[PDB]
Specification:
Layout (H helix, E strand, L loop, with lengths): L2 E3 L3 E6 L6 E8 L5 E6 L2 E4 L5 E4 L3 E5 L2 E3 L3 H10 L3 E7 L11 H9 L1 E3 L7 E2 L4 E5 L2 E6 L5 E7 L6 E7 L12 E3 H9 L12 E3 L15 H14 L6 E2 L1 E5 L3 H14 L4
Parallel strand pairs: 4-9, 11-18, 14-19, 16-17
Antiparallel strand pairs: 1-10, 2-3, 3-9, 4-5, 6-7, 7-8, 12-13, 13-19, 14-15
Helix pairs in contact: 1-2, 1-4, 4-5
The chain binds ligand TUX and zinc ion.
Pathway: Glycolipid biosynthesis; lipid IV(A) biosynthesis; lipid IV(A) from (3R)-3-hydroxytetradecanoyl-[acyl-carrier-protein] and UDP-N-acetyl-alpha-D-glucosamine: step 2/6
Cofactor: Zn(2+)
Function: Catalyzes the hydrolysis of UDP-3-O-myristoyl-N-acetylglucosamine to form UDP-3-O-myristoylglucosamine and acetate, the committed step in lipid A biosynthesis.
Length: about 270
């Protein structure tokens, strides 16, 4: 049934690309309200259609207002099945914190409440293949939500794939975002990642790990990618059901899958 937060929640922390202090406040809403962001007295529904800028991060914006990196929180909400919540975002981007969703998943999981209404699950009824930038993603109808990601790294990790299935969400929430020392300069050359640090960004070396804690999962970096792929699929504003596969996929290409899925099922 519709799920909402039992009590008001709030978080605070710098933004990975903005590197500015930002705070978020979450309040309960009415059943069938959906996920919406509020700022400067402006409400901004969280749906793909609201996608204003796609890049290493997912950004939404309406009426001249914009928010960066909103896929992470959306990913946790997706796994927890949250249908009504007003996330007030004070700032220009969602705080990166440690780089994973474990923090939001940890506090919110202890403050979830049940409402009195049945949720409308989104189910894929037809497959689809999107190829672009040398990347590719395929979707297939299914009675269970499953997402597979095949990442190809040229570092010591080499190639690694991670299959997520309903009942293994605990393995895709503690995976913090990661980056390679070779692509970092590029991300920095585009004026992004000004808040990226070793405490909120896991940096890997062609053959060495920068963070002294090492990797948290033999597939931590791909676990985060899968976690992000869901955060981008929840843009539909409702739990997605079906079997999806992604090979070296990005945010824009991912949103494209959702765009065609939401525009294809437009007839129904
Ligand atoms: C050596 C010392 C380095 C100082 C600290 C480095 C800071 C770099 C600036 C941070 C930019 C983001 C890092 C990054 O590229 O992570 C990427 C991630 C981005 C993301 O999280 N989007 O939401 C999206 O998925 C890909 C692949 O999964 C990740 O590579
Ligand atoms: Zn990410």
């Amino acid at each position: 049934l519709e799920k909402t937060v039992k009590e008001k929640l709030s978080f605070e922390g710098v933004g990975i690309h903005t590197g500015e202090y930002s705070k978020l406040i979450i309040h309960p809403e009415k059943e069938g309200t959906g996920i919406r962001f509020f700022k400067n007295g402006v409400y901004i529904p969280a749906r793909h259609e609201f996608v204003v800028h796609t890049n290493h991060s997912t950004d939404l914006g309406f009426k001249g207002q914009r928010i960066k990196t909103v896929e992470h929180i959306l990913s946790v909400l997706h796994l927890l099945e949250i249908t009504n919540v007003t996330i007030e975002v004070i700032g220009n981007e969602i705080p990166i914190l440690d780089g994973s969703g474990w923090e939001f998943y940890e506090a919110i999981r202890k403050n979830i409440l049940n409402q009195n209404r049945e949720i409308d699950y989104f189910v894929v009824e037809e497959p689809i293949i999107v190829e672009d930038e040398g990347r590719l993603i395929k979707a297939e109808p299914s009675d269970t939500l499953e997402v597979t990601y095949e990442g190809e790294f040229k570092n010591f990790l080499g190639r690694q794939k991670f299959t997520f299935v309903e009942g293994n969400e605990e393995e895709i929430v503690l995976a913090r975002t990661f980056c390679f020392d070779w692509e970092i300069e590029h991300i920095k050359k585009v004026g992004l990642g000004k808040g990226g640090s070793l405490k909120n960004t896991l940096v890997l070396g062609k053959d060495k790990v920068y963070n002294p804690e090492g990797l948290r999962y033999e597939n931590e970096p791909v676990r985060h990618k899968v976690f992000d792929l869901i955060g981008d699929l929840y843009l539909l504003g409702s739990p997605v059901k079906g079997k999806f596969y992604s090979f070296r996929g990005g945010h824009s290409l991912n949103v494209k899958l959702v765009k065609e899925l939401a525009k294809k099922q437009k007839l129904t």
